């Protein structure tokens, strides 16, 4: 696993394929990693190791990730962004 | 406004985006019975906002400044995520 504190390299390994997921991933690292537990950490850089389909599932709410660690990580990153996000009227 | 006419909100839930299929329409096919009658009214109203609103909004880009439309798209979330697989 990705070392928790190499932020410049994990910062890399947000730069994905698509673009929903570039702009949901890469803000949420730049304007919330600092903020996660150690523990938060370790689930984020987990998170990165799955999939683009199955993250673009689960950041839309199509299901969820069996692993409920993994599903914790995901609910966190939609409420940062959602909070974070433009206020559209 | 129109809360019955199911066959005219299940078109509405037919969006210019295709981004927009895997949320909208089958939540309505899912859920829209179970909502209270308050909750059918912001629902309509949140289908005629714009498509790039609610993609935003449904992928957590920001949110709506309207608190109905933010707790509606919250609860979409919510009931999308309960109902789709676990991978």
């Known amino acids: 696993h990705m070392d928790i504190n190499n932020k410049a ?3 890399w390994a947000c730069r994905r394929g698509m673009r929903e997921l570039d702009i949901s991933i890469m803000p949420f690292f730049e304007h919330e990693y600092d903020s996660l537990s150690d523990d938060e950490k370790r689930i984020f850089i987990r998170l990165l190791e799955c999939d683009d389909p199955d993250l673009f599932n689960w950041l839309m709410n199509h299901g969820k990730p069996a692993d409920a660690e ?4 995901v609910r966190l990153i939609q409420t940062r962004n959602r909070e974070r996000g433009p206020v559209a009227i």
């Open 9 to 11: 390299r994990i910062h």
């Open 70 to 73: 993994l599903e914790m990580m």
